[PDB]
Design a protein around this motif. Structure first.
Motif, short mmCIF file in Angstrom:
data_model
loop_
_atom_site.label_atom_id
_atom_site.label_comp_id
_atom_site.label_asym_id
_atom_site.label_seq_id
_atom_site.Cartn_x
_atom_site.Cartn_y
_atom_site.Cartn_z
N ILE A 110 -6.28 -1.40 -5.43
CA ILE A 110 -6.95 -0.76 -4.31
C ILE A 110 -8.42 -1.16 -4.28
O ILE A 110 -8.92 -1.64 -3.25
CB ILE A 110 -6.77 0.76 -4.38
N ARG A 111 -9.08 -1.11 -5.44
CA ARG A 111 -10.45 -1.60 -5.58
C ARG A 111 -10.53 -3.09 -5.27
O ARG A 111 -11.59 -3.60 -4.89
CB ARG A 111 -10.94 -1.31 -7.01
N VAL A 166 -3.84 6.49 4.15
CA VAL A 166 -5.24 6.66 3.77
C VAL A 166 -5.62 8.14 3.76
O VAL A 166 -6.62 8.54 3.15
CB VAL A 166 -6.17 5.84 4.69
N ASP A 167 -4.84 8.97 4.44
CA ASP A 167 -4.93 10.40 4.20
C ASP A 167 -4.31 10.76 2.85
O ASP A 167 -4.83 11.64 2.15
CB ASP A 167 -4.24 11.16 5.32
N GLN A 195 -4.51 2.17 -9.18
CA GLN A 195 -5.89 2.11 -8.75
C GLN A 195 -6.36 0.68 -8.58
O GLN A 195 -7.11 0.38 -7.64
CB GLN A 195 -6.81 2.83 -9.73
N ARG A 196 -5.89 -0.22 -9.46
CA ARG A 196 -6.58 -1.49 -9.69
C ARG A 196 -6.53 -2.40 -8.48
O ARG A 196 -7.53 -3.05 -8.14
CB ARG A 196 -5.98 -2.18 -10.91
N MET A 233 -1.37 3.44 9.26
CA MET A 233 -1.42 3.87 7.87
C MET A 233 -2.37 5.05 7.66
O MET A 233 -2.92 5.22 6.57
CB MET A 233 -1.81 2.70 6.97
N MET A 285 0.82 -1.20 0.00
CA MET A 285 0.00 0.00 0.00
C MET A 285 0.86 1.26 0.00
O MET A 285 0.46 2.29 -0.56
CB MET A 285 -0.95 -0.02 1.20
N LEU A 310 -10.32 -3.81 -0.67
CA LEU A 310 -11.53 -3.55 0.10
C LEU A 310 -12.61 -4.59 -0.19
O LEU A 310 -13.58 -4.71 0.58
CB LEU A 310 -12.01 -2.13 -0.21
N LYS A 340 -10.04 -3.55 8.61
CA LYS A 340 -8.71 -3.86 8.10
C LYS A 340 -8.03 -4.79 9.08
O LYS A 340 -7.21 -4.35 9.90
CB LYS A 340 -7.88 -2.62 7.78
#
Lengths: 133, 128, 74, 755, 26, 55, 184
Positions: free
Chosen positions: C24-25, C46-47, C21-22, C42, C4, C28, C35
């Motif tokens: 990350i989708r 995530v900010d 991007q790929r 982290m 990440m 979740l 998590k």
């Protein structure tokens, strides 16, 4: 005292008191900023900027030393920044009286604006642009 | 007015008779009237019943009016109660009401592309 | 967290962020909201990912809404 | 354009002194300026009544019990009457003496004026038509007192007048010759000067306040008479209680100070609820809502020009600014936001379509001389007398750069390209012009060409030409983006100060050193020189602007006047400010073609093209009935309903003839509209769109029209420029709504799939 | 001390710039 | 850029294979780009809601 | 900061003044060649004050002593007039070697700081054309009392040998009239 009141066509008696207070503020600024160690660049820099802005204001038209700040700043110096004395010494009118007689009734122009006040002041760099209407 | 609610929602600094009578039949028009009347109700939607709230909202989208307030109601609902909606591990009878919301929300998808058409073509005649 | 932070490094420059991007989708979909329970630090991550993706939102929005204009005239 | 242009707004709220009050509705704010009366509505601030018979700049103001009657009093003692939409119903010189306070009943029968050493009460007229030479009737007058009456209080019975006096005393007046309790008994014993009294709304507590902070409580025992109940002595507060107002909730007190702080109290408890600071500038007067929920208080003219709205649960509802005399204006590329430049060195943004004071920026060390937008809508450049210029973006609120670098104390004119590459500024006291790349603040060159002070500068939309007007009878033209420089012309006449550009790069408008305002092209063919700037209550030429359609220019000097001109010779219309003691200093033109602006020392803008006037464009009345023939073309022939009812221009018809035609008919209509009836309907959609909720409906209209005649508005420019801007602001302000919330229901379904 | 003297002198200098600046453009 | 320089009805005027060719071209582009649009538009609000809970 | 230099002669130059003006043109990115259609305009003060330039160079010829160079700094107004040694036929050179944007090292020999120092300032204030400040060539100003000599050489290293390269013309000037200018 009233020698100054009568020399420069002052319309009032209050104006000598007001310019006396302003010159008093300049002298006490000079004394308070004077009493520092003379290698402190605070004192050198601030008295220097006070000298340069008093060049621009036309009061110290004479190029100066530090000690002139106690010496020459009077009421009559800033009174010689009044408009009709600039007008006379620029050889437009014939007396200071007749200059004030012209500004009372609207024929004099600094820049693009009409003037009718005998207490407008001029800089050392605005007096290039004085004409009639 | 149309700026008032959409600026009013972002916050920079009884009624209990009607929803249960709408638990009996389809009486949510008067309830949507007391939603559209006054009182920004960000504290009132936080004082089960959420299913009848979503059926009220599907009667809201059913008519062809006031979508600009309705979308704001839906999104604020997913801002406030979004954990009890989630139920930690979904597909209770909540998700049947969400499924009732989904397809009619797919019916209302058409308006966006028209706005893209006019924005881009008007931008072209502005440039060219 | 090791992958990440590489997504944090890959969200920087244009034209590659789509690859970043790929996954990350993906993740979740394959872990829960917590998590799973024991979670390291982290919040910087995530900010950090939100303004980059918020920035890549508008560009592809403009390519999409301008892409209709070549059809929409004739 | 021919329309009746008139004042129906003003530029920022409170410059001057006066009273202040709400409506009974709780949604309408009554906050005057000295010259006119500006009554806002609390939600979406707008402007309702605009009297002007005031020759002197102070007000005293109140409405009766439903807002159907408004007065306003100035120093002389004449008043003026309006009903709802500034009819100016009645007019009445009332007094040769000034008034201190005016008070209605809650019943609208009686009327209250305090003046001199007397007390006038008048029988109130109802709303009617006119037909009274003297509408006001005297009911009674009361004699007497010992000196002036300074505050006034009415009761619920409409029988009971409590009034103070200047002589440290209070008196009571029975209205209907009752002699209520057979007593008009004085109130004495007050060590200090009286600032107000109040009568409580339960008829048993009679209330007085003094200037020191003291409060005295009398009872309705009339052993037998007045006895004191609660005294105070304040010696260490050490200010003066300036103003006082009492709650209709009948529990709470409000006390305003000269020191600059805001006191709240309780009536029989004397507890300290809250005090709030806002400055050191004194509080002038304060008034409460009729339900105690909202507080508003006004601040004196020399101090703050600011009026706040604080609630009893302590949060400020409306904050504001509105500072003094103004230097510069410019319209944003969306026709809604207007920059101002003030003398004290701020830059404020005004949303003058809706009366908000949105946002400020404060980095100036002294006054601001020049503001102008860039055409991107991103950035705006400010010029100062600070000796530098700086950049700004809107809601990032962050200073890009501050260009300077030669020793300088005065800049006077700021202009940028449409390209956003280079920013030029003209020194008032150097005989040279400065440029800067916006990338760095590198200094490219110093373009030495003048012999006098350079004083006005502007670019072109062609954007290869720089227009440079200096104050030495010499207009100059420059090349910046080629590989050479240019030859620059000579005027015939008369030192210029005001330069203004056509948005074509083909015409240049100059203001000569007299009332003659003149134009010539870029092949120096002098078209017109035009006549003087009249209306003394010498003549000048200060600002001038080219309108956006390319058919008009607007001239403003400093002589209480502003003039309209077209491209040919003719004087179109002269509007002007009436008041009494410059006024105008800047004028520019809106991109909505509805109005424009004139920066005055009072502060006053709008022109407002309306549509109440009968225009007959293309033989209107051969279409004999506007009703029945249009009724025939609502049943048949929808092409002919547009051309018929479009030559007609009752706005009370265009809603129905525009609404009623069906959806499938619309591309057939737009494919067959004439090319001469196009711009007025393209301008009609761009200003009808922002009001209603018919977004789908108007959007399928603009799809049809913009799909229909794209090349025709591509070639026939400069009117559909204005209309196209008007529709584009509606497109963006709806797009940023529904894309946001449609995204906010686009995450939801896949968020269900997550877990 | 020295910092105090820089404080009051910078104060009166800031006031004096204002008082001359009133006469500077009037 | 090549659509704004020159052109579709300033190089020819006929309902030809290039004209219907462009229709399937732009449909391919708007679909393939709308896919990335929807993926990002779920990604961002997918990232926000865990920061809503890490209070 | 760096000056803007204008070069001007009488209306009638021959070849020998033409090539000479071509060498004096070679002090650019700020040296420009220009004749007048009158002999010397008396409006050159409005020319330089309007153009904002700083310095002016005039070539002419008189019969008190032979031919004369003239240099003046414009706003203040000091003006040195100097006499030349040779104007007969110089080299026909307009640009060769490097460009004149190259700021060379500058050499003064035979240091007289008594009364020629005002000269030594002006030659410093003239030849600062360009942002280089790094030596590729060199220009030599040789005092011999009231005789000065001008040289242009290029660095020619060979097996690390510091060999000079003579290029351009060879001048030898004398102090002619130097008018006492003003603070104005």
């Amino acid at each position: 005292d009233t020698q100054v009141m009568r020399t420069y066509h002052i319309q009032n008696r209050e104006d000598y008191h007001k310019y006396n207070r302003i010159c008093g503020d300049i002298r006490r600024l000079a004394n308070k900023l004077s009493l520092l160690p003379p290698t402190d660049p605070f004192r050198r820099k601030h008295e220097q900027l006070l000298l340069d802005k008093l060049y621009a204001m036309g009061v110290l038209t004479t190029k100066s030393k530090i000690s002139d700040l106690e010496n020459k700043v009077t009421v009559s110096a800033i009174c010689r920044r009044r408009l009709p004395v600039i007008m006379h010494r620029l050889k437009m009118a014939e007396t200071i009286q007749d200059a004030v007689k012209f500004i009372e009734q609207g024929h004099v122009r600094v820049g693009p604006n009409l003037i009718n006040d005998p207490a407008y002041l001029v800089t050392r760099n605005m007096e290039d642009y004085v004409t009639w209407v | 007015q149309k700026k008032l609610d959409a600026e009013e929602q972002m916050n920079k600094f009884h009624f209990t008779k009607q929803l249960r009578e709408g638990s009996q039949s389809k009486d949510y028009s008067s309830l949507l009237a007391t939603l559209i009347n006054f009182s920004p109700a960000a504290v009132d939607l936080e004082i089960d019943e959420i299913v009848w709230f979503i059926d009220a909202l599907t009667q809201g989208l059913k008519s062809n009016k006031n979508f600009e307030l309705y979308e704001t109601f839906m999104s604020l609902l997913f801002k406030a109660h979004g954990d009890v909606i989630h139920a930690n591990n979904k597909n209770q009878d909540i998700a049947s009401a969400l499924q009732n919301w989904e397809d009619v929300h797919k019916k209302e998808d058409r308006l966006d592309d028209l706005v893209k058409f006019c924005m881009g073509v008007a931008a072209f005649v502005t440039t060219a | 967290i090791l992958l990440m932070k590489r997504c944090r490094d890959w969200n920087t420059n244009a034209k590659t962020h789509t690859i970043a991007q790929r996954t990350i989708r993906c993740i979740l979909m394959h872990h829960n909201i917590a998590k799973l329970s024991e979670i390291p630090g982290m919040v910087k991550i995530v900010d950090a990912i939100i303004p980059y993706t918020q920035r890549h939102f508008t560009r592809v929005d403009n390519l999409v809404e301008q892409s209709y204009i070549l059809d929409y005239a004739l | 354009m021919k329309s009746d242009f008139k004042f129906s707004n003003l530029l920022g709220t409170v410059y001057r002194q006066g009273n202040i009050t709400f409506s009974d509705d709780g949604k309408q704010l009554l906050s005057p300026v000295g010259n006119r009366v500006s009554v806002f509505d609390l939600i979406n601030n707008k402007s309702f009544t605009f009297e002007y018979e005031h020759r002197k700049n102070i007000a005293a103001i109140d409405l009766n019990k439903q807002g159907t009657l408004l007065i306003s009093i100035d120093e002389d003692g004449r008043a003026i009457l309006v009903n709802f939409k500034a009819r100016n119903v009645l007019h009445h010189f009332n007094f040769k003496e000034k008034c201190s306070a005016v008070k209605f009943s809650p019943d609208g029968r009686l009327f209250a004026l305090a003046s001199g050493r007397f007390l006038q009460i008048w029988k109130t007229p109802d709303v009617n038509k006119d037909r009274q030479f003297a509408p006001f009737v005297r009911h009674r007058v009361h004699a007497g007192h010992f000196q002036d009456i300074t505050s006034l209080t009415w009761s619920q019975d409409s029988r009971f007048i409590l009034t103070t006096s200047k002589d440290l005393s209070a008196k009571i007046w029975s209205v209907d010759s009752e002699e209520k309790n057979l007593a008009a008994t004085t109130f004495n014993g007050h060590r200090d000067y009286v600032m107000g009294a109040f009568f409580s709304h339960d008829q048993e507590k009679i209330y007085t306040v003094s200037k020191d902070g003291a409060v005295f409580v009398w009872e309705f025992t009339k052993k037998y008479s007045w006895r004191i109940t609660k005294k105070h002595f304040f010696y260490a507060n050490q200010a003066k209680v300036k103003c006082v107002t009492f709650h209709p909730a009948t529990r709470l007190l409000a006390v305003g100070f000269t020191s600059g702080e805001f006191r709240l109290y309780d009536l029989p408890d004397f507890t300290l609820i809250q005090q709030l600071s806002m400055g050191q500038n004194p509080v002038n007067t304060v008034s409460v809502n009729q339900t105690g929920e909202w507080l508003a208080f006004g601040s004196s003219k020399l101090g703050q020009l600011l009026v706040y709205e604080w609630q009893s649960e302590s949060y400020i509802l409306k904050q504001q600014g509105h500072f003094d005399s103004t230097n510069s204006l410019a319209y944003s590329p969306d026709g809604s936001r207007v920059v101002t430049a003030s003398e004290d060195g701020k830059i404020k943004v005004w949303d003058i379509t809706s009366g908000f004071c949105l946002a400020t920026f404060e980095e100036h060390t002294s006054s601001v001389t020049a503001v102008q937008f860039a055409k991107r809508g991103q950035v705006m450049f400010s010029s100062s007398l600070d000796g530098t210029v700086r950049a700004w973006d809107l809601i990032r609120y962050r200073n890009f750069r501050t260009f300077t670098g030669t020793e300088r104390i005065q800049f006077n004119c700021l202009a940028v390209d449409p390209s956003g590459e280079v920013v030029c500024a003209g020194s008032l006291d150097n005989f040279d012009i400065h440029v800067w790349s916006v990338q760095t603040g590198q200094l490219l060159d110093a373009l030495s060409g003048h012999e006098g002070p350079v004083s006005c500068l502007s670019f072109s939309q062609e954007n290869s030409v720089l227009a440079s007007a200096s104050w030495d009878k010499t207009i100059r033209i420059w090349s910046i983006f080629g590989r050479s420089q240019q030859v620059e012309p000579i005027e015939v006449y008369s030192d210029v100060l005001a330069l203004s550009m056509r948005p074509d790069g083909k015409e240049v408008a100059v203001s000569t050193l007299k009332g003659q305002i003149s134009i010539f092209n870029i092949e120096d063919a002098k078209q017109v020189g035009n006549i003087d700037c009249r209306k003394d209550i010498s003549k000048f030429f200060t600002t001038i602007h080219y309108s956006f359609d390319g058919m008009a220019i607007v001239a403003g000097g400093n002589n209480n006047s502003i003039c309209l001109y077209d491209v040919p010779n003719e004087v179109l219309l002269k509007r002007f400010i009436v008041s009494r003691n410059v006024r105008v200093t800047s004028v520019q033109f809106s991109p909505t073609a509805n109005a424009f602006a004139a920066a005055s020392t009072e502060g006053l803008l709008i022109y407002s093209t309306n549509d109440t006037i009968l225009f007959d464009p293309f033989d209107l009345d051969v279409d004999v009935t506007p009703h029945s023939t249009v009724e025939a073309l609502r049943e048949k022939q929808f092409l002919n309903a547009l051309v018929m009812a479009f030559r007609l221009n009752e706005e009370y018809l265009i809603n129905k003839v525009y609404e009623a035609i069906p959806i499938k008919e619309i591309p057939l209509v737009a494919s067959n509209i004439p090319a001469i009836y196009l711009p007025r309907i393209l301008k009609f959609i761009g200003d009808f769109a922002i009001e209603s909720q018919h977004i789908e409906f108007n959007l399928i209209w603009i799809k049809a029209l913009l799909s229909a005649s794209g090349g025709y508005i591509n070639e026939h420019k400069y009117l559909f420029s204005t209309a196209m801007r008007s529709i584009q602001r509606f497109i963006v302000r709806v797009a940023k709504e529904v894309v946001n919330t449609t995204t906010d229901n686009k995450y939801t379904y896949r968020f269900l799939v997550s877990t | 001390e020295l910092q105090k003297a820089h404080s009051e002198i910078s104060e009166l200098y800031a006031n004096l710039v204002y008082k001359l600046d009133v006469l500077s453009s009037v | 850029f090549i659509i704004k320089f020159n052109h579709k009805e300033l190089v020819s005027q006929k309902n030809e294979e290039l004209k219907l060719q462009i229709n399937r071209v732009k449909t391919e582009l708007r679909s393939a780009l709308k896919s990335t649009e929807d993926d990002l538009g779920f990604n961002v609000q997918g990232l926000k809601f865990v920061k809503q809970q890490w209070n | 900061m760096d000056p803007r230099i204008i070069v001007t002669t009488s209306r009638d130059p021959s070849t020998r003044l033409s090539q000479f003006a071509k060498e004096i043109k070679l002090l650019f990115p700020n040296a420009v060649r220009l004749n007048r259609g009158n002999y010397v305009m008396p409006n050159l003060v409005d020319a330089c004050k309007k153009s904002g330039t700083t310095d002016l160079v005039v070539l002419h010829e008189h019969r008190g002593v032979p031919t004369s160079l003239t240099i003046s700094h414009f706003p203040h107004g000091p003006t040195a007039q100097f006499s030349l040694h040779n104007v007969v036929m110089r080299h026909d050179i307009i640009n060769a070697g490097n460009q004149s944007e190259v700021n060379p090292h500058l050499i003064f020999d035979n240091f007289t700081t008594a009364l020629g120092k005002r000269v030594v300032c002006i030659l410093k204030h003239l030849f600062n054309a360009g942002p280089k400040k790094d030596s590729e060539r060199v220009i030599t100003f040789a005092n011999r009392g009231d005789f000065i000599s001008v040289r242009q050489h290029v660095y020619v290293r060979t097996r690390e040998g510091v060999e000079i390269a003579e290029v351009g013309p060879r001048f030898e000037m004398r102090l002619f009239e130097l008018r006492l200018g003003t603070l104005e």
